[PDB]
Design a protein around this ligand. Structure first.
Ligand SMILES: Cn1nnc2ccc(Cc3cccc(CO)c3)cc21
Length: 126
């Protein structure tokens, strides 16, 4: 019970869309960040039981991780790039909320966020 259900990766009453920008967010942005040496903490939902973080979901009420984002992109779950970028930003912000400046996990998120921003600065045109 320490872990809530992970965020949904499909929703039949939500419309889907496929765009050049969403394709780029999967092929270039997510799949490149995924290979970074600091990506591993963010490739799956925070497991509060395995990680000995029993208060994580007492603090973080909109969890997000790159595994969820990846599955959402593979499902064409998002309407537009902004919706996907919002999930990335939630993932980073959650890490800064739960942890403190200078923590190793925060140094990891800070470096990934910089790479993320570099890659979404220019997106393809439709
Ligand atoms: C994804 N996430 N969000 N908050 C976390 C806290 C601890 C962890 C585990 C962890 C991983 C790398 C470095 C440390 C030490 O700083 C701890 C993962 C978290």
């Amino acid at each position: 019970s320490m872990n809530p259900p992970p965020p949904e990766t499909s929703n039949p009453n939500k419309p889907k869309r496929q765009t050049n920008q969403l394709q780029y967010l999967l092929r270039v942005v997510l799949k490149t960040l995924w290979k970074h040496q600091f990506a591993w903490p963010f490739q799956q939902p925070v497991d509060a039981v395995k990680l000995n973080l029993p208060d994580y979901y007492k603090i973080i009420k909109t969890p997000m991780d790159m595994g969820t984002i990846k599955k959402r992109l593979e499902n064409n779950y998002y309407w537009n790039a902004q919706e996907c970028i919002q999930d990335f930003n939630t993932m980073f912000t959650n890490c800064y909320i739960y942890n403190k400046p200078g923590d190793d996990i925060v140094l990891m998120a800070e470096a990934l966020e910089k790479l993320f921003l570099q890659k979404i600065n220019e997106l393809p045109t439709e």
